């Protein structure tokens, strides 16, 4: 035990996570937090249309958020309230191009309804000498609640299960989010019985539990990048792409 | 991670488990589903007749949900002293800590004893709940739609007040959802409002306008429990609480 | 081998040492040094009174010394000459309260004679970038020797067995001291044939072998805390507490 | 896994490499690079004289190069073009004394021809916070090539096999060089059919791939020391020591 | 280390191996020894008679080595357009990447067809190669030593130009070395020069000075391959290359 | 830790063990207990009679301990040249490196040969040793207590000087301790002084005051070894030593 021998290759073991044609590596073990067991398929109950998961394209990773986490951010501080089935699309529309330009999200342009799980990796690139800690918490249906504006603090999301991203360890936060909405499908576009709040399963929100702490000449900033996989999906209701409207900018 | 446990620095010995009071009191309190089946006061209202009511006209309505109603403290002069002083009770204190529910509810509406008139009770699962505003007991005004009257096909029951002035119910889960919402509700989606309350119970008297005067300003209290099928699903932590014995005393 | 993956929980394994109701943890492996094999009980030879070790209270740990070890302390420098069966009592009397106020030392107030072993943990809290080294050495009956005033240096206590407390490793010094006095019991109070030098088995003394070394902006101080357990004890000669006098202040 | 417990003895495991009476230790695993398989003996074909390897003296390690590697050295920078059967002798003659003064090289003074393998350890003593990388490359018969003056860069010696000495890991470069010359023996002195370019098997040359990088107050220099063993040797043609002339100074 | 491989971050699936073109073209190209046995142009020269040549006098010589000759672009007025434009060919492009060689060579010298005279060819393994300067084809001047004439004991062959004007050779490894040098050669050691070329082939015509006029300024082209025993030993990386299609075009 | 051994960088081969001189000299020197049993000079004194001595009066006394006496160099004019020049000998050089002892001692007191008188020797284990001051040979003055005379119950022996002027002893471990102190002794505790010396041997002549004049200023030398039961217990390192051949020579 405890025999450090670094070389030109480096010291530690690098773990992978391969998808279709996306491999993204982390030195550190993830702090996984799984808020619910894995969802059943549920196309038998409400779909006669041809249903197929496009796992060769949809299960790839895609960056949907990157943000500087400075030490100027105080203690109780939001960093990103990502609405994850929306944020996969609104990140692309924030890149000033359409949904059909990205391989991950072309069945959202075509199909009408979606049910699937979501993997989320909230990777950080902090220094070893920086001291601080994030938490990444998934809340099911944030915008269908009106007192969440008072719950949205680090004391309230520490009670439900969540991941912790310490800035010392440069930790990575795996986050397996299965589908639990009230209705067993999320429409990707304006559907006859609801138009407002489209494709909103809930909110990944990333508060600060400890701010960044350092010396006077220490590295101030800290970049955080969020990736999302859409693994156990299924799309139903093949429809035209001209009925898909752009997401709300938020 | 949340419930991780790195280094338990235990100084304790073994403490004898009572079985959540089974060893002392003859009953276990571990299962919080069976504490939820003790009846809690749901609502409390004085019967206020506005217009000339027919036999069909519903006296009051309320959306039926385990989250508790939009809490009526009362008017600033005359507050309802239980919902003023004893805030929120138990069932929305436990249902405050969850996100979805799938199950039934029980009601046990208690009527005044000065009245004698026969009372009908409708369950209406058609009704959507348009926001946490007006998620409360509605003393009904003059009839404009089919909301304000007795209706045919919906499941009803008629308590005879002369035999016993309490009707006891079991309001089933008639939603097209997997499960319904359980926190307070702002109605973002237009179909999301079909998924909060189990339905919308309307209680109405069969009295004419001459017997309607003995009904006026008599109390009707409603209770509820969760009825053995209720399964609160997703763990969501509690919100900021308020401590009750720090509420100010009525200084003389 | 050599796979560093820190998390929010930290990296390494934490070892414990539980006693009655005192658990004190160290990240590092101890540098144990045991000057003698474990002593036999020896109440058969000189005691008809009721003898009992109070292991539920006496075998707890108790802090008896804490001292700042600065870089201003030179090379050959005493830091603490602790007389350990006395220092357990004189630390309490240095806390400006009686011996009967502490659970560890109430049988010293009652009983007249004591024989037992002593565990000593000399814990340090130095930084990883500080460089220096203590030694913790137990000398049997310091004050029954008159040339110890010339022996008391780091060259003389390196010859007998001793522990080393390096300031880089933040090392911990376990030190198992069994009972070897000339007489098989140490009186806790003024006993008819000796009055001077009471309850003096010997001296733990903590010299400096390397002083603290650092940069200009490095952490100057270094706190050292000494704990003592009194494990294989026995007390005999139940007597009044009014014959116990306070220890000499030293 | 990953349980750091340093002590007074230090943390890691130290590996050795013992020879006749020379033991030299490295904390780090070597980056071995072996340009050819091990050579056969080949005294049967061209020697009737008494042939003996002096493995009790010749197989010792001997320092033949030490050089400061500062950050002032640019990217494509030679640090040492060592001609290794010569550099073992020219280092000694650079120490201003004869070849017969060193135990490793007395059979070069006596014998006329040599065939053997050469171990080379290019040890570095960089800090953990320094960033940079050397490569140590063996080229067979540098001076029998005229376009090597254009090949001598880090892009050309990265193509043949070579060792890498990262300044972060303080890595060590083992380098097993078997005998591959055109003729199966290298003369140690002026031999009838060649006089120029004596005892030249080739060149160990140590270029820079990444220069040293550091802070403003970081450690600027970095010392590199090269050791050589002469293990599977054999010497033939016992001759007088007065025919051995001194090596060219270079 | 060179070929170490720390973390292969592979996004690829499996690609079907063709067997280096065996699946498509009916032939494998993995072994680069058998590509080296395709004949490459070694040299190219015009027969320039200087003095009155006897029957013994060698017309030209060349040191025989797989490294390619010291590359003759030509005079600045009249360049040899292949070695000007198509630099260096294949066999010294592969032998540029190695250090030692041990093996034989083949030559296939092609003679002009206007000449008829009988042609002798000597292999002379005695000859040392004094540096990369004059490691080239030498049009021989007047005879001063035994270099300039036909010699007795060396292995020779006589092609009759009237039957076929091409002599095909197999020049054996007659060195006293383990293996010979393969890069360009600066001749540091005096005996190292015995270890570059396999020997020194001299081609000479048996014509008198009246038939020597039809020989003048006729081309003789030489080829070479590596002849099945050639084993390039020590891997040495390539030197700086020059890209050919960036060479300037002859602007009109 | 003290005797830890992290990385033995051994260049040595195997050295043939002699067995601590057993292979060469026919005897092993590993056990240092058997070197301690060679007799060392303990004390050295001139018989100085002060007052008129009776037959009972002890001529001199000394506390009996393996630590060596409080070392008498002598007066500044006339030093005892062995304890001046040859400092401390072997047995307190080994007993300097230990803390406790439990065992016996041997003495072999050597008397002058000019005297003839019968000599008695008392062992007195009652006697406490009050500090390292006066842990030495005491020429006894006039009698005030029972210290100064022959006593009854204590173990005695009478050497006849006419037969052999050396009495050889074995002074047993008569202490009530586990083991006694072995370094120099400052007498902190009042009962600690019962635990340094084995006892207190007093040697006395049976001569009257007419034969006392031949006794005056004759040397009596004492020896000691450790007598086969001596077990030095706790390892304590050595103190600062003084090197003997750096002591100054008596310059003429």
TrEMBL record, chains A, C, D:
Coiled-coil parts of chain: none
Cellular compartment(s): Virion
Full-length numbering of the shown residues: 116 to 365 of 2797
Protein name, entry field: Genome polyprotein
Disordered: region residues: 1-15
Organism: Deformed wing virus
TrEMBL record, chains B, E, F:
Compartment annotation: Virion
The protein's name in its UniProt record: Genome polyprotein
Organism of provenance: Deformed wing virus (DWV)
């Amino acid at each position: 035990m405890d025999n450090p021998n670094p070389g030109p290759d480096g010291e530690g073991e690098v773990e992978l996570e391969k998808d279709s044609n996306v491999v993204l590596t982390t030195q550190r073990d993830p702090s996984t937090s799984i808020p619910a067991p894995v969802s059943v398929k549920w196309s038998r109950w409400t779909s006669n249309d041809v249903v197929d998961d496009y796992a060769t394209i949809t299960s790839r990773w895609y960056q949907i958020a990157e943000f500087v986490w400075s030490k100027d951010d105080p203690f109780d501080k939001e960093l990103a309230r990502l609405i994850l089935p929306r944020a996969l699309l609104s990140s692309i529309e924030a890149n000033s191009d359409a949904i059909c330009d990205v391989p991950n999200t072309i069945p959202f342009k075509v199909h009408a309804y979606w049910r699937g799980d979501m993997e989320v990796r909230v990777q950080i690139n902090s220094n070893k000498f920086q001291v601080g800690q994030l938490q990444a918490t998934w809340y099911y249906s944030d915008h269908e609640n009106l007192n969440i504006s008072s719950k949205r603090s680090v004391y309230g999301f520490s009670q439900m299960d969540h991941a912790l991203i310490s800035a010392s360890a440069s930790n990575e936060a795996k986050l397996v989010i299965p589908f639990k909405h009230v209705y067993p499908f999320l429409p990707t576009r304006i559907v006859p019985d609801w138009t407002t709040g489209i494709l909103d399963m809930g909110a990944l929100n990333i508060r600060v539990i400890a701010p960044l702490r350092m010396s006077a000449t220490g590295p101030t900033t800290c970049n955080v990048v969020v990736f999302i996989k859409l693994n156990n999906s299924e799309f139903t209701g093949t429809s035209s792409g001209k009925f898909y409207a752009s997401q709300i900018r938020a | 991670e949340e419930s991780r446990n790195t280094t338990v620095l235990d100084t304790t010995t073994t403490l004898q488990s009572s079985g959540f009071g089974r060893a002392f009191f003859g009953e276990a309190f571990n299962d919080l589903k069976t504490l939820m089946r003790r009846y809690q006061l749901y609502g409390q209202l004085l019967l206020s007749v506005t217009t000339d009511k027919d036999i069909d006209h519903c006296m009051f309505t309320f959306p039926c949900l385990p989250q508790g109603l939009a809490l009526d403290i009362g008017s600033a002069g005359s507050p309802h002293e239980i919902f003023n002083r004893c805030r929120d009770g138990i069932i929305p204190l436990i249902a405050s800590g969850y996100r979805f529910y799938r199950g039934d509810l029980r009601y046990k509406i208690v009527f005044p004893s000065n009245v004698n008139s026969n009372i009908w009770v409708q369950h209406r699962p058609d009704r959507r709940l348009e926001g946490w505003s007006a998620a409360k007991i509605v003393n009904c005004d003059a009839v404009s739609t089919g909301q304000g009257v007795y209706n045919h096909g919906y499941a009803s029951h008629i308590q005879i007040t002369r035999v016993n002035n309490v009707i006891e119910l079991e309001v089933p889960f008639y939603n097209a959802t997997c499960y319904n919402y359980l926190q307070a509700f702002n109605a973002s989606s237009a179909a999301s409002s079909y998924a909060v309350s189990l339905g919308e119970i309307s209680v109405g008297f069969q009295a004419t306008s001459d017997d309607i005067a003995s009904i006026v300003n008599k109390p009707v209290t409603i209770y509820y429990s969760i009825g053995d099928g209720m399964q609160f699903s997703q763990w969501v932590g509690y919100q900021p609480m308020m401590i009750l014995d720090q509420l100010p005393a009525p200084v003389v």
